[PDB]
């Protein structure tokens, strides 16, 4: 008789590669100003 179909699976990409792409939201975004305080040019003043 009539029998519909399902398309789900062990297709973990619906939520796994989602977390792996989190690095593209943080590691790529980590290309901000260099934290480095160059010395002898531009000294850090002691408190």
Partner 1 sequence: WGRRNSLWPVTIGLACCAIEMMHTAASRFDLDRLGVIFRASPRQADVLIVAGTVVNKVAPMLKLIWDQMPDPKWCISMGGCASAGGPFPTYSTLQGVDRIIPVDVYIPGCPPTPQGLIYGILQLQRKIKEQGITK
Partner 2 sequence: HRGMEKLAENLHYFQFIPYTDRMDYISAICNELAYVETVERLLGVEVPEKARYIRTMFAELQRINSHLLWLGTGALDLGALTVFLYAFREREKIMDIIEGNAGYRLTSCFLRIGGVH
29 binds, among partner 2, partner 1, none (CB under 5 to 8 A by kind): none
Contact string (CB under 8 A) for partner 2, positions 17-46, x = contact: ------------------x----------x
Q: How far apart are CA 18 and CA 3, in angstroms?
A: 33
- Residue with smaller CB distance to partner 1, 12 or 42: 42
Q: Which residues bind partner 2 (CB under 8 A)?
A: 35, 46-47
């Amino acid at each position: 008789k009539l029998s519909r179909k399902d398309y789900l699976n062990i297709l973990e990409s619906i939520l796994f590669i989602d977390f792996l792409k989190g690095l593209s939201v943080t590691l790529k975004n980590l290309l901000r100003r260099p934290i480095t305080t160059e010395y002898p040019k531009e000294k850090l003043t002691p408190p």
